[PDB]
From a paper:
There are at least three reported GEFs for Rab11 (3, 11–15); the Rab11 GEF distributed most broadly throughout the eukaryotic kingdom appears to be the multisubunit transport protein particle II (TRAPPII) complex. Yeast TRAPPII comprises 22 subunits encoded by 10 genes, and yeast have two Rab11 paralogs, named Ypt31 and Ypt32. Each of the 11-subunit monomers forms a triangle shape in which the TRAPP core subunits appear to be grasped by tongs composed of the TRAPPII-specific Trs120 and Trs130 subunits. We describe two different conformations of TRAPPII: an open state that allows Rab11 to access the active site chamber and a closed state in which the Trs120 lid encloses the chamber to enable Rab11 activation.
Within the dimeric TRAPPII particles, individual monomers exhibited two major conformations, which we refer to as the open and closed states. Rab11/Ypt32 was not bound to the open or partially open monomers in any of the classes. This is consistent with the idea that closing of the Trs120 lid is required for productive binding and subsequent nucleotide exchange of Rab11. Among classes containing at least one open or partially open monomer, this class resulted in the highest resolution reconstruction (4.5 Å). We therefore used this class for further focused refinements and obtained focused maps ranging in overall resolution values of 3.8 to 4.2 Å, which aided in model building and analysis of the open conformational state. Compared to the closed state, in the open state, the catalytic core has rotated 16°, and the active site chamber has undergone substantial expansion. This expansion is accomplished by two major structural changes. First, Trs130 has undergone a bending motion in which the leg region has moved more distal to its position in the closed state. Second, Tca17 adopts a completely different set of interactions with the core in the open and closed states. In the open state, the distance between the Trs120 lid and the TRAPP core has increased by ~10 Å relative to the closed state.
Numbering used by the authors:
A (entry chain G): 2 to 159
B (entry chain D): 2 to 24, 29 to 151
C (entry chain E): 32 to 64, 88 to 266
D (entry chain H): 2 to 76, 98 to 147, 166 to 219
E (entry chain F): 7 to 190
The structure:
């Protein structure tokens, strides 16, 4: 199963947050809660600090990137794109290879509803005082939340 | 199919909003007369109304000028709906009646929807009448070509 | 098999170019009345605040922008019969075909080409006018403002819907019925129940009323 | 093929980084110090991040134990017999970073109870689940080798670089058997 | 993994959606014709507006290109040119520009084309020979898209078939690979 889902961008601030907690599909889905903003900063700090290690000790001309971070309890799966968007997800074991899912989440549910969404804006900078990493205006694209929850409900097997 | 010959909807204050007819020149007057007579038919204890699951009840009222007039009322909105059909074009089957009340339900739904706020610059009564005429063209003057 | 033996361009880029023209109309209007390229800088509003401004625009402002966009659509639709995919291969001529067949053309083939699918059902009264419906309407299938904002969505969107009315009020012109004669208005309408739910909150309609 | 190993004494600070590649030596020594420091920072910051689903109730103290595998090491010093240990042993870093998977390598951790950290970088991406067991077993093996050949040594100050000879020439054979 | 030419030849035939090129040309020509006919016939203030159009198209379109192809971040102008000249254009416009006119120590390059689909059979009025480029949206897209992958450059045409040159050419000069932001 999956414990939570987080999206970050090149301006180093979380865009979308969703943690399920309870085993049910329609669990306490505190979508874009202000409660977990400290956890959001904490996790971004983890991923940014630990990306530098593999970014330094690379070989050849591939310039690799992380795929997964494990611990005793949970396991992290990340997709990092040239656009700077990070697609971190906190999940459990017994799903060993998982990057296909994050490529799906980028393929036709973010561009299909967040960057083909002329009403909604592209990456939420808004002329300084947020783009450095402290300000917050989040994604609330109705279609994005709806179809994302519908697609990820089966993957919360608990 | 069933072709309504005239449609008329009236509010609580007995205010003619729309007496639309599909498409003779001087028959619009006769439909206006029959609609007003049907409005007269309503406020009375001459025939029973409602008292069936607190639901609206279609019923035939009268026939004149060679067109039979069916009528219906909404208790909880003050809406007063009446439609007249060509007498010769009605067979009187149970399935025919089952189609007629469905027509009443549909036209009631369309009017209730068009009365709603959105896509109205100011909720102008002229625009509301024009839109209602457009949708009453849609319902009864369609063909569904392939 | 001549239909596919011609080069192609990606539907993604074409769709997005077709989409952001309401931003073009609002931008050109605001230019009429800090990014550096040519040593004098060019400013721009980022294609969504333009949308929000056009939503909260004045009445005459909005009417002028819609007229400009409709002119664009008329230009799109004017040269569509001389376009080199209908002139030669398909076996429908353009001698006269008074009504009916012309709307079959614009409804069946033109929509399949301009947009990504064939249309849904149309309706006719045989006197002067036709009604066209589409339940998904591809070029706007990914627009949504916010969760509990199910009223401002259609108001913000209805400027985009003035392009297909442009092509419709076009191609009739130059094939025999002129703009003053033909009047046609595009409006929203909900889908039937037996279709998938989360395509759009409502379908879309067109009300061609050529006078003959 | 574990191409590199290293260790972090108690509070960050590299002490041994003998890298078992044919010939690369791209990374300079001072860079690995910053690498180890930030890695220790990642351990420090990883603890208070677990999702709220599991924190209130764990009910999972049966999977923490690590199964034993007979001859992962070779084919001794203070220990004797064919192999260092046979009884299935227990994890200690129940809420710490364990693995790091990338396109080009995979890094495994073993944290000693007191605070010593053992890092193993292998080019081989071991199905990524049993790989944890393999890595922890081999890491405990080199940890026992360390406890033998680095601490039963007079000329060794605590938490300082390991300037040993038997330790490195023995862990070399230990890795070379594992391929 | 595969060569960038194949990564693009194997996707244009497999997972896209297609339309008629001269339909796309007629649409773009209608837009730019409306620009010209709208206000004062001025050919200078249409150039910057088409540049802005292209900027918005590209800034919104880069996210799709990575999504379908999923390349890494581009670092040097050589790999950037190889990418945008042998997979990106092949995906989008079905054209394969080849590179020419590298400057000293690779501070820029230049794209050259002879089959630009944005205007194919578009021999234009005599008035346009000074300021109107007619394909400014392309360079707008290039700058706006490349701005989103952390490398900053300015793009501008030098030659075009339409104004009476041999083949059309665009210069892409880089300014600085700006660094990533840190939270603090
Ligand atoms: C490394 O990540 C660099 C990637 C290269 C930039 C992507 C360029 C995509 C845009 C191509 C042009 C599309 C057509 C625009 C005109 C409608």
């Amino acid at each position: 199963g999956i414990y939570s889902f987080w999206i970050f961008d090149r301006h180093c601030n979380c865009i979308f947050d969703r943690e399920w907690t309870l085993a049910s599909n329609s669990a306490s889905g505190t979508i874009n809660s202000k409660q977990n903003e400290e956890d959001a900063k904490l996790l971004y700090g983890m991923i940014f600090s630990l990306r530098s290690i593999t970014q330094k000790l690379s070989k050849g001309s591939v310039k690799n990137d992380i795929r997964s971070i494990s611990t005793g309890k949970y396991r992290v799966h990340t997709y990092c794109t040239a656009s700077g968007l990070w697609f971190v997800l906190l999940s459990d074991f017994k799903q060993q290879s998982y990057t296909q899912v994050l490529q799906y989440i980028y393929s036709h549910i973010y561009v299909k509803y967040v960057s083909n969404n002329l009403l909604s804006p592209y990456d939420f900078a808004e002329n300084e005082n947020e783009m450095r990493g402290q300000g917050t205006r989040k994604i609330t694209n109705r279609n994005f939340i709806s179809v994302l929850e519908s697609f990820l409900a089966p993957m919360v097997n608990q | 199919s069933l072709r309504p010959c005239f449609v008329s909807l009236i509010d609580e204050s007995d205010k003619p909003i729309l007496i639309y007819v599909p498409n003779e020149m001087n028959d619009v007057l006769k439909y206006n007369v029959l609609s007003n007579i049907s409005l007269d038919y309503f406020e009375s204890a001459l025939v029973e109304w409602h008292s069936l699951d607190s639901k609206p009840l279609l019923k035939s009222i009268f026939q004149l000028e060679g067109v039979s007039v069916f009528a219906m009322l909404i208790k909880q909105t003050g809406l007063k709906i009446v439609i007249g059909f060509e007498q010769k074009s009605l067979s009187g089957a149970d399935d025919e009646f089952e189609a007629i009340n469905q027509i009443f339900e549909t036209v009631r739904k369309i009017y209730i929807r068009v009365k709603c706020n959105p896509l109205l610059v100011s909720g102008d009564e002229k625009s509301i009448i024009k839109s209602l005429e457009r949708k009453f063209d849609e319902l009864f003057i369609s063909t569904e070509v392939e | 098999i001549f239909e596919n033996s011609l080069p192609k361009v990606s539907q993604s880029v074409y769709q997005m170019l077709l989409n952001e023209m309401v931003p073009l109309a609002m931008g050109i209007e605001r230019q009429i009345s800090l990014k550096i390229e040519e040593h004098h800088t060019v400013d721009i509003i980022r294609s969504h605040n333009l949308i929000h401004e056009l939503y909260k625009a004045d009445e005459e402002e909005k009417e002028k922008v819609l007229a400009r966009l409709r002119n664009i659509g008329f230009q799109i639709g004017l040269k569509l019969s001389e376009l080199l995919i209908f002139s030669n291969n398909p076996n429908l001529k353009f001698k006269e075909m008074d009504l009916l067949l012309i709307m079959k053309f614009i409804c069946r083939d033109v929509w399949k080409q301009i947009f990504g699918k064939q249309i849904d059902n149309l309706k006719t009264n045989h006197r002067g006018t036709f009604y066209l419906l589409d339940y998904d309407y591809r070029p706007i299938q990914s627009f949504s403002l916010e969760e509990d904002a199910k009223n401002e969505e259609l108001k913000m969107i209805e400027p985009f819907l003035e392009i297909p009315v442009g092509i419709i009020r076009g191609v009739l012109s130059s094939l025999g019925y002129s703009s003053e004669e033909v009047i046609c208005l595009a409006s929203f309408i909900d889908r039937p129940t037996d279709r998938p739910k989360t395509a759009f909150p409502k379908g879309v309609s067109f009300h061609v009323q050529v006078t003959m | 093929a574990i191409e590199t190993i290293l260790v972090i004494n108690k509070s960050g600070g590299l002490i041994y980084q003998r890298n078992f590649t044919n010939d690369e030596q791209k990374l300079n020594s001072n860079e690995y110090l910053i690498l180890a420091s930030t890695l220790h920072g990642v351990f420090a910051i990883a603890s208070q991040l677990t999702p709220k689903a599991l924190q209130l109730t764990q009910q999972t103290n049966i999977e923490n134990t690590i199964p034993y595998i007979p001859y992962v090491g070779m084919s001794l010093g203070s220990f004797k017999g064919d192999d260092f240990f046979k009884e299935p042993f227990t994890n200690w870093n129940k809420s710490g970073l364990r693995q790091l998977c990338t396109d080009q390598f995979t890094m495994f951790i073993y944290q000693t109870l007191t605070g010593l950290k053992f890092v193993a970088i292998s080019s081989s991406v071991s199905t990524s689940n049993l790989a944890i067991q393999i890595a922890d077993n081999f890491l405990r093996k080199v940890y026992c080798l360390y406890s033998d050949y680095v601490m039963k040594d007079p000329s060794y100050s605590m938490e300082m670089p390991i300037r040993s000879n038997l330790f490195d020439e023995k862990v070399k054979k230990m890795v070379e058997n594992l391929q | 993994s595969r060569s960038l030419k194949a990564m693009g030849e194997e996707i244009w035939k497999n997972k896209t959606e297609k339309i008629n090129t001269e339909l796309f040309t007629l649409t773009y020509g209608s837009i730019v014709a409306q620009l010209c006919q709208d206000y004062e016939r001025d050919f200078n203030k249409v150039n910057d507006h088409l540049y802005s159009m292209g900027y918005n198209i590209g800034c919104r379109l880069i996210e799709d290109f990575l999504a379908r192809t999923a390349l890494p971040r581009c670092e040097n102008l050589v790999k950037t040119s190889e990418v945008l000249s042998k997979c990106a254009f092949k995906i989008f416009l079905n054209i394969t520009p080849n590179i020419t006119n590298w400057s000293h120590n690779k501070d820029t390059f230049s794209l050259i084309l002879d089959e630009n689909p944005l205007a194919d059979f578009v021999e234009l009025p005599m008035d346009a020979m000074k300021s109107l480029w007619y394909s400014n949206i392309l360079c707008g897209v290039l700058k706006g898209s490349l701005e989103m992958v952390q490398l900053d450059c300015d793009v501008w045409f030098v030659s075009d078939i339409l104004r009476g040159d041999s083949q059309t050419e665009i210069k892409v000069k880089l300014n600085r690979i700006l660094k990533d932001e840190i939270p603090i």
